Amino acid sequence: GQRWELALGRFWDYLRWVQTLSEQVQEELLSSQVTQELRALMDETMKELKAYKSELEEQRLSKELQAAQARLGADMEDVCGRLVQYRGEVQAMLGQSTEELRVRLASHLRKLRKRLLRDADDLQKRLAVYQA
């Protein structure tokens, strides 16, 4: 276990739910609830990571960590941006079927998640070294 790791897992779990694009997710995507929920989980994750690095200081590499940290932050934002895009494309469809939009979202979302996953594992690996 590890605080920032647990917070990241909550964001992770939340996003995996969104990926399902179930009825409740779809309702929520058309409000700002999903992106607000994610923004909070994202903020918590970044807060904990900052506290964690700060404490690790007490036991080039810093700029590589700061940037792997940045990658994660940008990946989380990219996801939300894609979610905002979806709400807008739905509005633009003027009530017309969104199934096609959802197929496309799911596939893109899957890739943005794969990215986030690889940047979190990298960040973890650098930390595991910074550890000791």
Which residues make up each annotated binding site for heparin? 112-115
Q: How far is CA 81 from CA 30, 32, 41, 111, in A?
A: 13, 12, 15, 14
What 3-state class would DSSP assign to 101? helix
Angle between helices 33-56 and 99-130 (to 10 degrees): 10
The amino acid that residue 122 corresponds to is: D
Q: Residues near 78 by Cβ (< 8 Å), separated by ≥ 6?
A: 112, 115
Which residues make up each annotated binding site? 112-115
